[PDB]
Amino acid sequence: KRERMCMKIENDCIFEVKHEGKVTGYACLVGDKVMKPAHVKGVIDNADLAKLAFKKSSKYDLECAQIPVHMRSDASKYTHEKPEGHYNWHHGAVQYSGGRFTIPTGAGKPGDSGRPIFDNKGRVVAIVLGGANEGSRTALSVVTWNKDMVTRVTPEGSEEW
Amino acid sequence: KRERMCMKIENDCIFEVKHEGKVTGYACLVGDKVMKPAHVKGVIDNADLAKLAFKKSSKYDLECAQIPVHMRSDASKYTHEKPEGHYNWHHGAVQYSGGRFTIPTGAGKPGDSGRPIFDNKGRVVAIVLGGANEGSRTALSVVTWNKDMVTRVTPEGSEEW
């Protein structure tokens, strides 16, 4: 149920990014804007999106674009609240404890940056950027949201995916 | 259940200190800081924890260091709230009443400095330094936490274990 709605919202809000014939990342559409990892390079698999002017931010490691109105109806829902506990992810469950996101499985790989992380009700909370091999786990360097501001959390030793 | 959780948490978060072939104390991993009683002399029984830079604060009787990344997952999670009642410890139960941590049994022995005091949730609350024998009870000279301030509480007649 929760996994299924997570997956279909991912289907409606994830686009593949190609470069030299291999996948590199994904751009996700939230609210009224498309957002992409700035560190990764490639092209979006959409003629409308590829022509948009991407506002760049290297200190946040993010790229943004204002969507055309005719995909406004295909927009995921955002939030700023991050209650302590568990959240959904395309590869299982993520744990938010003590101000950090961790993957219990520790199976992180390069090329998955830009996959949204969901809330219980299907709202999006944050976007995966990179991972640090925390032994049997992986700690996430992730871009998240304050009430009206963007923040980035980067654990020591994290490497961009 | 609580005893089992305390046991595995302690085993994954405690390492003995070797000096002259004898144990002098224990070093625990809480949050993102390794702690060691400053009065305890010796070396931590771990190669990775042996070479770390340790910052000492004699007025707090504590030496703290930053963990290597590959072990940050093996650390307990902390709290700053001390409701009245009783809490767990490696030698049974401790009584927190009136800002005083008391050993009902007086079973502490020198060389046990550095053993964490656990919450009813398994979270770490304080690290013991010594005990003061008042009558049949043993008040605890122990290091605890405010919202962000470390405080070393010490009864009269306390002896550094």
Added chain:
Amino acid sequence: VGMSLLALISIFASCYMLVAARSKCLTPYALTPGAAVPWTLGILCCAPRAHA
């Protein structure tokens, strides 16, 4: 030579004692997993420029 040597003693002692004051004021914050309070950090610089 005497005046110069006294001047060097004064400047070294003062700078060292400022460093000691810095470490003593900033010591409790390195023992908790807490924030550095940028109000303190800006006035009082530290080894961690951005981390912690």
